Every structure is written in structure tokens, then in C-alpha cells.
Scaffold this active site. Structure first.
Site, PDB file in Angstrom:
ATOM      1  CG  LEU A  85      -1.770  -1.336   1.326  1.00 24.12           C
ATOM      2  CD1 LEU A  85      -2.697  -1.322   2.545  1.00 24.12           C
ATOM      3  CD2 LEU A  85      -2.579  -1.615   0.052  1.00 24.12           C
ATOM      4  N   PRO A  86       0.300   2.442  -0.297  1.00 24.57           N
ATOM      5  CG  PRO A  86       0.201   4.774  -0.660  1.00 24.57           C
ATOM      6  CD  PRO A  86       1.172   3.627  -0.391  1.00 24.57           C
ATOM      7  CB  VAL A  87      -3.942   0.618  -3.689  1.00 29.27           C
ATOM      8  CG1 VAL A  87      -4.724   0.557  -5.009  1.00 29.27           C
ATOM      9  CG2 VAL A  87      -2.747  -0.332  -3.700  1.00 29.27           C
TER      10      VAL A  87
END
Lengths: 123, 123, 123
Positions: B61-63
Site C-alpha cells: 500500500l497505498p493504493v
């Protein structure tokens, strides 16, 4: 389970069918859901819509979101991550290192089928 | 615009509010939507639920998934990717390279606001 | 159909059950799908995770994403938007104006049911 795969455009219909086939087998083996309970949506995106490191590129994909009713062990989820990732990378013919998996747990009070909650239904 | 932001667990209310503010400004600057139309939804996931390369790790992440009514130019989308990624990396103190952005366009016939379609409202 | 619904944390189990009941009936009334095929995934988010106009507030919700196999008409999708928003506003005791619906049509080549494509199943 409901799976959503973010993938780039250009993959053949037969390859998408082979991806749906493999991800279902992957989910059955990993967490033991009946094959028939696995629903998949493939979300194809143009390169203009895909960002990696702040630049447009299909290399950001694939991203798999897997939505499960709460209750699976960490071990099951680890196996799910491993199987979905290996399946996606092998079918789409990309590096395992490029695959992302995100698992959403849904409490049985927060899942509905046919208008009844999962908890109402015994799940 | 509606952005779903997948984060690992643990961030303070302050850091989340900083991310909500920065991603809202990043969206305004990049594609010009009014701030009041920008919804930021932070989904936090346990490390057991987050896969990169087939292995559990917060480094997946982040997405960011950015849901937009269709009609934004390629250049606007490239700016959205750039601004969302730089803001995410700065506020979260993570590598820009780890950031991912996916833009999902919604036909104006398929998008609803206050019970009316976007096409019926002139968008 | 599958509905992914984002709502603020903390509503009672009874309220969530009524939302699942109402949104299922809304989907049946709008597009004639059998109730037995309507799945609902409620995703609760705390107020600290929910931004509108760059500030944390429950007014950024409800957001409903409706996943449908492609083929529904514009009129049906318009009805779906009207019915889900209506019922959302009513059950959650929230303004109709604040409701958001996004429909995601999935091509039948891109949807999987039990390991088979919707296309292969004649849908």
C-alpha cells in the site's frame, strides 16, 4: 467471495476466461469456499487511468481485491494471498513481484444475500 | 470524485485528516472538481489482509481508487495520478515508488447524485 | 447484482439489516433481478476515515457502488439510482441529496460465476 481484479486492456477473452478459472480454483484451495460461491469481476483500465510511482503505466497492475465474510484465519488469508498472486502472475504472464492483494473482511451483520443478513442465514 | 484509499492499520486521526485534506487539494488542482464534491474514503487493512508479491506486508500500500464521471482528458488523469501519488507519499512518509492509483470512469448514465443521473443533471 | 455500500460506523445491527432488506427490494423494483441474486457488502468506516470537502464528516456517505453484468438499459440504471438513493436516505435517515450511486457495468467476458464467464453461461 467476491474478487475484483484491476488489469490493463489488451488481454484476450480466452485469457480472461482462464484467469476467472484459475482465481476460482485458487480461492477454493486457499479458503475452502465452494467454487459456485466465487464471483469475479475484472476491471480493465486504459493505461491513462493506471498510476505507478506517479506515472501512467500498466506495470501498476494487477491489483486483486478479495471480499470475504469475516472469520477466516490469518493462515487462510496468507494462502489466499499466495494463490491469487501466483495465479494472477502466471495467467497474465507478469512478475509475481508486481501483484497486489487486498482482503476486505465483512462482518456477518454487514453481509446480505437475498435481503437477509449472513448472520440471519447462519454464516 | 470519490477516492477509496487503502492504507495499513495504525495511522492517527491527525494523519488521516492530513491525508484527507491533501488528497482533496490534489484532486481539486489536478482535475478541477470543487472541493465540496470530493469524497475521500480511507479503508484500513490489517497486515494479514495485505499482499505484495504473494506475501503479507504493508509495503503493498497505498493504493488509491479514484472514481470519476467520464469525460476527463488523458492529461488531467496524468496530473491526478501525479498529484495523488506525491501527496500520498509525502503525508504517509513512504516511497513515491510504492504508490498506486487506479482511475475508474463512470458513464454519466451510470452515476447518481441525489437520486438523479449525472446525464440528467448535465454532466 | 452486488452492492458495495459505504456507511458511517456505529449503526445498530437492526438498522443494517433493514438497509440490506430495503436495498435488495430497491434493486428488485428497479431492474427486476431476482432477490435471490442480490448480494450486499456493507463497509463501515469511522468518521475519522471519511472526508467531504477535505474535512472528516459522515456527510461524505452513503456511497453505493452497484456491480451489474452488462446489458441493463439506461432507463433501468436510472431507476436503480433513484430506488437505491431513496431507500438509502430513508433507512439511514439522511438527506436524499447526500446519496451517491455508481453503477459498474461488467462485460460478460469479464464477469466470473463459479469459474465460468457470464458469457459462457449465456448472460
Amino acid at each position: 467471495p467476491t474478487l475484483e481484479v484491476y488489469l490493463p486492456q489488451g488481454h484476450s477473452d480466452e485469457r480472461k476466461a482462464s484467469l476467472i478459472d484459475g482465481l476460482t480454483r485458487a480461492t477454493v484451495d486457499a479458503i475452502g469456499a465452494p467454487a459456485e460461491s466465487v464471483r469475479i469481476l475484472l476491471t480493465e483500465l486504459p493505461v491513462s487511468n493506471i498510476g505507478l510511482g506517479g506515472k501512467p503505466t500498466p506495470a501498476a497492475l494487477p491489483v486483486i481485491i478479495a471480499i470475504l465474510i469475516a472469520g477466516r484465519t490469518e493462515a487462510q488469508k496468507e494462502a489466499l494471498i499466495a494463490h491469487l498472486s501466483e495465479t494472477s502472475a502466471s495467467v497474465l504472464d507478469v512478475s509475481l513481484q508486481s501483484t497486489r492483494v487486498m482482503i476486505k473482511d465483512i462482518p456477518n451483520t454487514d453481509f446480505g444475500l437475498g435481503g437477509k443478513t449472513a448472520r440471519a442465514l447462519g454464516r
